[PDB]
A paper describes a structure:
The pose of the inhibitor is also nearly identical, retaining many of the same inhibitor-enzyme interactions as the WT complex. Overall, these structures show that GC376 binds with the same orientation in both structures and minor adjustments to the enzyme are made in the H163A mutant due to the absence of the H163 side chain. The existence of this reversible reaction explains why the H163A mutant was able to co-crystallize with GC376. As the small proportion of mutant enzyme with a free active-site sulfhydryl can react with GC376 irreversibly, all mutant Mpro molecules are eventually sequestered into a complex with GC376 despite the apo mutant primarily being in the disulfide-bonded conformation.
The main protease (Mpro; also known as Nsp5) of SARS-CoV-2 is one such protein essential to SARS-CoV-2 replication.
Residue numbers in the entry:
A (entry chain A), B (entry chain A): 1 to 305
Amino acid sequence: SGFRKMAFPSGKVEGCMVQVTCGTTTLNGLWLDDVVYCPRHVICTSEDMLNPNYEDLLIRKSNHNFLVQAGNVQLRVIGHSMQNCVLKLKVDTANPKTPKYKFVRIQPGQTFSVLACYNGSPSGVYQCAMRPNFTIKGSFLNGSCGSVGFNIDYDCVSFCYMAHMELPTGVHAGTDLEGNFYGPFVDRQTAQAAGTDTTITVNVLAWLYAAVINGDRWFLNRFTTTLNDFNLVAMKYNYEPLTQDHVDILGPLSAQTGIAVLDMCASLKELLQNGMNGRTILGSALLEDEFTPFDVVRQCSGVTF
Amino acid sequence: SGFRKMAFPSGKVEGCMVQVTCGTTTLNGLWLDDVVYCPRHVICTSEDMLNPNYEDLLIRKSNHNFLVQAGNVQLRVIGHSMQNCVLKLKVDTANPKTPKYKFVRIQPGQTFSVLACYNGSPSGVYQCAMRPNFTIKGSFLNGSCGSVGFNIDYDCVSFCYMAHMELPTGVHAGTDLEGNFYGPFVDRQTAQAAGTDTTITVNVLAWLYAAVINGDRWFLNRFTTTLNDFNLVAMKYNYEPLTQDHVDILGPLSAQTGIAVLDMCASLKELLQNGMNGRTILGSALLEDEFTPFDVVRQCSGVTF
Ligand SMILES: *[C@H](O)[C@H](C[C@@H]1CCNC1=O)NC(=O)[C@H](CC(C)C)NC(=O)OCc1ccccc1
Ligand SMILES: *[C@H](O)[C@H](C[C@@H]1CCNC1=O)NC(=O)[C@H](CC(C)C)NC(=O)OCc1ccccc1
């Protein structure tokens, strides 16, 4: 029993992290096959970040201006190109630790593990979720750019995120591994505000099912509700509108616990209207929304990789 | 910026996890050099667990009754011995992935990362802390025994925990890697109650310093207090008594934030007496006590391994 915020084993990703230096700027890169992926602002100085013209900045950059280092061994850069906001550095040696991998762009509400790195060296691993405003609540200091988020399917590593920047509200933003930012953000040292921090309703419900599985059941009320009525109460507390697809996804957890999805929505509705009265649910005094229905099933079943 | 519950990279430990089968029972083991460490109750059946006599049960167990499997390759068992509550299986092949390692028994209040495994395969990684009642709040299903907790010092993996059992209150208990249980617990299928769940006061204070570093500062009051006066209020809320050593350990964080330790204690005292008024601190509606002063410094500085 027990339920914990759990990240994937980071071993397969640690073997792909390198250090990319371009002048004064040093950040992390991802060495897959004979390609190194890193944020394109590695070519910016302490002044160009306000309004960088990456096409012009890349003109006076040659293959030899990129220092790619894996541990204490250097990789020879034989080619480079800019794909959106990521830089692809063609090296001459294929990474011997390259695992089976995919490039996947995730949707808001999906979760992934982040391997925070500095100078091409892993610092730690923690679980995240793509917010509805396309940001992530992470832990990133200077030099952490290039750290990647990933999911693991058995033996296939699914790369979905790369850290690029922090927003003025202490929240972070990045791109997928094809260089396209999540959301309306740009790799620019400007004032970019994020939208309203919406709560992932289907994830709260899946987390409530996890609590029922693990003994926490005081919040189970004697009420039920409808989808439209719940969404009227959810829209005032900045909750994602619940859809019929979300109900279907919660199907497995509903059948396993004998508690209908709409009955669980009524329990959430009361927790939103009455609070938690100082009580806790799975050791949390607040409603957690960073477990997908899939994370709950995986953790409660013992799925390995 | 940002502060997250962060576990060490699990890569160095994934390469040491094996599957140990003894009859019907299957659990995980730790392959270091030519030794495999696993809980001794791998030799118990579904009935002996109530009152096992491990000396007698081990008499009719031979080297060949232990099936150690690393992936799809088997290790030949050439010797076995019982050291307290762990079994040491002498194999003929040294693990080629053995990292620099230590066997360290940690104290209550220290933190470590757990690599939850099933059938010798890693499932996930999460950060824990040794509770003052010598339990841990983890996520363990059937077949997870043998999973280990660890800290990493640069390139040295410090092994400190091995999962053995769950207590009737959904909390977990285990031993160090020399077989000695943490606390008064025994590897027995009996009713073993845990003590009062005390909060690690020095860890709450270190976490409050982290909040001040990361912008959360509404809880900073205009008060101060003394050590004795704080402990009078802390003993009623089941908080660990604060000592002068704890003050010294918080020295680095105090000097970095310009906030004296006793001033921070006064802010905690008010949070204990008045609550958090529905507000949050680093995204938590409850006081977190699973960050040591060292975890805070490490995460806020960018220490790599
Ligand atoms: C990359 O290492 C670095 C990581 C930041 C710094 C601390 N946490 C992070 O996520 N990011 C940058 O250097 C980036 C440069 C590009 C925008 C070209 N700028 C940045 O992220 O600064 C943070 C910030 C930006 C705008 C307003 C307030 C803060
Ligand atoms: C080892 O795989 C297993 C892990 C338990 C089961 C789910 N979470 C855990 O931590 N532990 C055992 O099989 C163990 C056997 C030894 C005590 C010989 N027994 C156990 O942990 O059962 C849990 C329990 C014990 C006593 C009261 C209530 C529950």
